[PDB]
Amino acid sequence: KVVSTDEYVSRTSIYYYAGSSRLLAVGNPYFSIKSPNNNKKVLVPKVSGLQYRVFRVRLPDPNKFGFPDTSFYNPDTQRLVWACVGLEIGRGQPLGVGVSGHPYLNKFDDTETSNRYPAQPGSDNRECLSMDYKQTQLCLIGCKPPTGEHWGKGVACNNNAAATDCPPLELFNSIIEDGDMVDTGFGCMDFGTLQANKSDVPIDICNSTCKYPDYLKMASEPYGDSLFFFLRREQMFVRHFFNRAGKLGEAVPDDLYIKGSGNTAVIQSSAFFPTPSGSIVTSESQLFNKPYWLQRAQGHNNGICWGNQLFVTVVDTTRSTNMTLCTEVTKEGTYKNDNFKEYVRHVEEYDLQFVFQLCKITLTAEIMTYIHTMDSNILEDWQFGLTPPPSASLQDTYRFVTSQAITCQKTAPPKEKEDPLNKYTFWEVNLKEKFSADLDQFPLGRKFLLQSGL
């Protein structure tokens, strides 16, 4: 029986603060350089706001504590789970958007205004251009890590069809981690497998598999534990129209139009492609740096962070400019072009401040089985399902280890390997001992109490 988190819990009146300090992360906008001698030795990373900025907290066990009151807390059955009731993001940059572009872009011509005939043969016609992207501001919170689809290839088919060669396809549903790339309008897809030139796409994203989040299946998720709340604001329009340069694999049927002759005898290709433009942004369009109060969640988990962990994400585009350097090598007297050298960087700062409420959860013989149905982990994180371990009778009983009748002993148990998150590179925060209760000494609890009717 599916039941929300409002039907078996007791709402206390104790509230505790969290707040994060200065995040340090500055890197190169385009790519991460490595050592030429070693691939695991970077000096600067690739940073951008167009990466999925997916972060995770570390919060301590509230049952690890000592307080003079335990009249509220029967330690036999009752337990303590954390829940978030307040939040704010802190950001620390002036507004500025950067632009990018492949230096060998697949622009054959422009197809907005005119085409004097005809297209010409040739195997090499690429050039540098540059353009902005889709703008946004967004976030999401849930105590399971957020998901996301992205399109890719498929298995081809059986060889019953002997018609042509056009490749298969599939979307791929995945929990997205930190660093992965958002789609910007070319579909949420792979650029290495689905494309083949890597010259339709700018270099930073030409070697990527961009995704789009699957809020839809997270909506049709039963409990709603990967989603508590989410935001979005986006706008777009075209800048110009250009065309690809390759063999169009598909022909066009003929009676749909009339063909011309002579100079107009050649039918030009129709492999057009647009190029984007975000609109003007204002400070009235700001999403961040405000409180968004929990009063009504979308699903069954009402703010309850299971596992004392949370999975926060954000994508911003208005602070996506890149500051660069321009230094010389030689001191001169006049202007030469060979003298000066550039280095470009990109800056990021995240600040995260929260308000909570602990809640005592009494454990009967019935709710313990209900959570046993959801997931047995938090149950044994409360250590409630135990079995008495046999096997005491051991007599490996010597005084010495360096002998002549060896048994080839083996050790180093790797036993705590239980985390699934080891394959997934996040950026994290351990905020565990940064806590107090004096919300008057915090620039958000003061705002909370006047909001809370206190």
Partner 1 sequence: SVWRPSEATVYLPPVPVSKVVSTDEYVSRTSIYYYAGSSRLLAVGNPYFSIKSPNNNKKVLVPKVSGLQYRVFRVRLPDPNKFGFPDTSFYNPDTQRLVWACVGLEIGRGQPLGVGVSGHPYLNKFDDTET
Residues 261-280 that bind its own copies (CB under 8 A): 261, 264, 267-274, 276, 278-280
Q: How far apart are CA 79 and CA 37, in angstroms?
A: 53
CB 105 within 8 A of CB 127: yes
| Sole binder of its own copies in the list 54, 89, 141, 188 (CB under 8 A) | 188
Told to check if 284 binds partner 1 by CB under 8 A, we report: no
* Tokens coding 213: 């989040």
Q: How far apart are CA 214 and CA 148, in angstroms?
A: 4
3-state helix, strand, coil in the chain (%, to 5): 10, 25, 65
| Sole binder of its own copies in the list 6, 127, 234, 375 (CB under 8 A) | 234
| Sole binder of its own copies in the list 325, 374, 421, 437 (CB under 8 A) | 325
Among 50-58, 78-86, 126-134, 395-403, the segment contacting its own copies (CB under 8 A)? 126-134
Among 136-144, 276-284, 369-377, 401-409, the segment contacting partner 1 (CB under 8 A)? 276-284
132-171 residues in contact with its own copies (CB under 8 A) are 132, 134, 166-169
Among 7-15, 139-147, 151-159, 437-445, the segment contacting partner 1 (CB under 8 A)? 437-445
Give whichever of 147 and 317 is closer to its own copies, judged by the CB atom. 317
Count of residues touching its own copies (by CB under 8 A): 109
Told to check if 106 binds partner 1 by CB under 8 A, we report: no
Told to check if 246 binds partner 1 by CB under 8 A, we report: no
Among 23-31, 51-59, 238-246, 347-355, the segment contacting partner 1 (CB under 8 A)? 238-246
DSSP string, 272-335: EEEEEE-----GGG--SSS----S--SSSS-SB-GGG--EEEEEE-TEE---EEEEESS--SS-
Told to check if 216 binds its own copies by CB under 8 A, we report: yes
179 binds, among partner 1, its own copies, none (CB under 5 to 8 A by kind): partner 1
Q: How far apart are CA 361 and CA 378, in angstroms?
A: 13
DSSP annotation of 54: E
DSSP annotation of 439: G
| Sole binder of its own copies in the list 87, 140, 143, 189 (CB under 8 A) | 189
DSSP annotation of 211: B
Residues with Cβ within 8 Å of residue 184, at least 6 apart in sequence: 50, 133, 134, 205, 210, 276
Q: How far apart are CA 388 and CA 146, in angstroms?
A: 38
Residue located via tokens 């030009």: 268
Min. distance of Cβ 139 from its own copies in angstroms? 16
Told to check if 130 binds partner 1 by CB under 8 A, we report: yes
CB 158 within 8 A of CB 141: no
Told to check if 179 binds partner 1 by CB under 8 A, we report: yes
Min. distance of Cβ 163 from its own copies in angstroms? 25
| Sole binder of partner 1 in the list 2, 24, 40, 67 (CB under 8 A) | 67
CB 23 within 8 A of CB 47: no
Give whichever of 77 and 269 is closer to its own copies, judged by the CB atom. 269
Told to check if 184 binds its own copies by CB under 8 A, we report: yes
Give whichever of 23 and 358 is closer to partner 1, judged by the CB atom. 358
Q: How far apart are CA 65 and CA 58, in angstroms?
A: 16
Q: Where are the beta strands (DSSP E) in 101-188?
A: 135-142, 147-152, 170-175
Told to check if 311 binds partner 1 by CB under 8 A, we report: yes
| Sole binder of partner 1 in the list 6, 170, 234, 375 (CB under 8 A) | 234
